[PDB]
Design a protein around this ligand. Structure first.
Ligand SMILES: Nc1nc2c(ncn2[C@@H]2O[C@H](COP(=O)(O)OP(=O)(O)O)[C@@H](O)[C@H]2O)c(=O)[nH]1
Ligand SMILES: [Mg+2]
Lengths: 25, 386
């Protein structure tokens, strides 16, 4: 989960909360 | 006592708001003052040593000791302040927003603190009032801990406190406000060791002028910047030439002897045996073994942009400007690393430097880079090699 969130954040340039919300959605 | 601190972190994360928060909370018991946000955000600009910096110098004290608090309104201002060392910060309050914590500004700020030599970082996270959740806060805490561990900082044992600067300014007694700034003050008063005094450091004195007195010997003048020198103290001459041994036979100021030469005062000191041409400006006097000379070293160099006077053209590998170490200029050849051929103005990276002759240096020493008398950058020694 943490790695996926970090990868998504690095890919989309969004914030931590937004990346986590997208990952959990 | 007196301690220098400051808030580092990403822009908009609330560094200025938090600085005002500690100001107002320390105003309890009149230790500080209720501080307006705008007054501190309007940092004055000082063009010291041909380098222009916006810095807001907040001051307050606690029952433990007085604090000098440093704030900058931008990344360039922070970088300039760290590298020119307007006020060395022995403690840094890493301001991390409760959301979007590990941004590249914080990424480079932690590395900059490591390079410049900030010994201790205390982590505080704000904007917790905008965050309703707990596991993402824990994830941010884990991220900042790992990032601190990534650059030689403790991380695992690094105190992390959680709050909200806006609530602290508002006056809410909720844990994320005044209680949060109150513990943060506690970690500032406990975790940060009392910094060493100049007079407590090992003796060192750069040599500015070399005299000779009949019947007395060789006199070298300069401001002692650490420790104490007394008659009978064994001292060594380190710098341009190879290290030479001598012994103190007298410390005098205005043709009158002093009991000892302390740090911060421009005393003159007599040397035993050494001749007037065996010593010259640029060399330092130091306790034997305290410092060593080096020609090759790695330094965190900030290249001034044209806005600070600076320079029109970028740095490049093989550029050999003059390097100024406290009393002397020495030609050093810039040596970049792999994948850095061009070094843009206004940036800061780590380069290797090879001086034409050795200079007494150790990690943490600061120097100016110039050509033609125009400052083209500033630096700080991060590693010395033989
Ligand atoms: N809700 C909330 N807002 C904050 C907090 N800290 C800062 N802010 C807001 O974020 C803005 C920018 O923060 P600031 O201190 O100016 O960051 P800096 O300019 O980089 O030092 C401020 O104008 C505040 O209104 C906080 O703890 N909680
Ligand atoms: Mg600011």
């Amino acid at each position: 989960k943490v790695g996926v969130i970090k990868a998504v954040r690095e890919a989309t340039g969004l914030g931590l909360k937004e990346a986590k919300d997208l990952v959990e959605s | 006592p007196h301690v220098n601190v400051g808030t580092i972190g990403h822009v908009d994360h609330g560094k200025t708001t938090l600085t005002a928060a500690i100001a107002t909370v320390a105003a309890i018991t009149s230790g500080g003052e209720a501080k307006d946000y705008a007054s501190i955000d309007s940092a004055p600009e000082e063009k010291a040593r041909g380098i222009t910096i916006n810095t807001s110098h907040v001051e307050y004290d606690t029952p433990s000791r007085h604090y000098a608090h440093v704030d900058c309104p931008g990344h360039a201002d922070y970088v300039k302040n760290m590298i020119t060392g307007a006020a060395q910060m022995d403690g840094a309050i890493l301001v991390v927003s409760a959301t979007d914590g590990p941004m590249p500004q914080t990424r480079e700020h932690i590395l900059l603190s490591r390079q410049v030599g900030v010994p201790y970082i205390v982590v505080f996270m704000n904007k917790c009032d905008m965050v309703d959740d707990e596991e993402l806060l824990e994830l941010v805490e884990m991220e900042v801990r790992e990032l601190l561990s990534d650059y030689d900082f403790p991380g695992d044992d690094t105190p992390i406190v959680k709050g909200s600067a806006t609530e602290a300014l508002k006056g809410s007694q909720e844990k994320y406000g005044q209680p949060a700034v109150v513990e943060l003050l506690n970690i500032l008063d406990t975790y940060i060791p009392e910094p060493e005094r100049d007079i407590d450091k090992a003796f060192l004195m750069p040599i500015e002028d070399v005299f000779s007195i009949s019947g007395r010997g060789t006199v070298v003048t300069g401001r002692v910047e650490s420790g104490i020198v007394k008659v009978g103290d064994e001292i060594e001459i380190v710098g341009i030439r190879d290290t030479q041994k001598t012994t103190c036979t007298g410390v005098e100021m205005f043709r009158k002897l002093l009991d000892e030469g302390r740090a911060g005062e421009n005393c003159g000191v007599l040397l035993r045996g050494t001749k007037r041409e065996d010593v010259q400006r640029g060399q330092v006097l130091a306790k034997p073994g305290s410092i060593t000379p080096h020609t090759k070293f790695d330094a965190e160099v900030y290249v001034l942009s044209k806005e600070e006077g600076g320079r029109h053209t970028p740095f490049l590998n093989g550029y050999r400007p003059q390097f100024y170490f406290r009393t002397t200029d020495v030609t050093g050849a810039i040596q970049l690393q792999d994948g850095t051929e061009m070094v843009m103005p206004g940036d800061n990276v780590e380069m290797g430097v090879e001086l034409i002759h050795p200079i007494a240096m150790d990690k943490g020493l600061r120097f100016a880079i110039r050509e033609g008398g125009r400052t083209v950058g500033a630096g700080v020694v991060a590693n010395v090699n033989v």
